[PDB]
Design a protein around this ligand. Sequence first.
Ligand SMILES: Nc1nc2c(ncn2[C@@H]2O[C@H](COP(=O)(O)OP(=O)(O)OP(=O)(O)O)[C@@H](O)[C@H]2O)c(=O)[nH]1
Ligand SMILES: [Mg+2]
Length: 231
Amino acid sequence: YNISVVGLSGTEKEKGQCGIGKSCLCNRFVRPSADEFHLDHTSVLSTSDFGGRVVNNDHFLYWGEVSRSECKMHIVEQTEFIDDQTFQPHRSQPYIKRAAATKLASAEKLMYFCTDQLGLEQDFEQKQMPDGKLLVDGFLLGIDVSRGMNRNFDDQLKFVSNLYNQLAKTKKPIVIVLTKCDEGVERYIRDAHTFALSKKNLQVVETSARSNVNVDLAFSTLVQLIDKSRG
Ligand SMILES: Nc1nc2c(ncn2[C@@H]2O[C@H](COP(=O)(O)OP(=O)(O)OP(=O)(O)O)[C@@H](O)[C@H]2O)c(=O)[nH]1
Ligand SMILES: [Mg+2]
């Protein structure tokens, strides 16, 4: 099962200086131990970092393989990395099209652990993404329902709707995932539920990576929809 985690991404200004929680969700699913869960996963990278084997000149990360409870899940996060001097996106398609990619070729791409790893990967375990290539089986569509540093929520939901349209054209299974529900805003959660109820069989899993609630449920729910359609 190849799972792509997608959501609002871009420049600091487009994220209101607060990402929506993709990285912490992936980190908690793949490595839920306190020692391996990191709350801080910056997307502002030096050219050396971006060209390292973890990022591999891509705007996505390979978070690794999960083999828990027998189903194998391969996890990736689609994001956007900005330059640590110019603060513009690294020149690697627009995010909404990039994130909806279902064929992800990055030869010799290494699994991501933390930003400390970047440009220093000999210092960490070096596990390669399988075959240098992943055919995406399904998408988790993250929606931050936290007030999260005075975010323009309606612009988030507009972005989510356009991203959803691109994903839906693929006919791949999508599960909507509400993030940071430990700080959830009822108006935002309700708006997200109304949006998802406007779509066909769009499931919503309410998660908090920080408090570790319903993360596994989110991924297993997607895996179940994946085999719904595979059958
Ligand atoms: N309260 C709470 N805060 C969270 C949670 N998850 C993430 N955050 C905060 O939100 C910020 C965003 O974290 P990320 O997971 O990197 O967000 P992102 O979607 O990956 O952002 P980009 O990768 O830059 O697109 C983090 O610095 C955390 O402090 C959560 O589950 N609960
Ligand atoms: Mg991220």
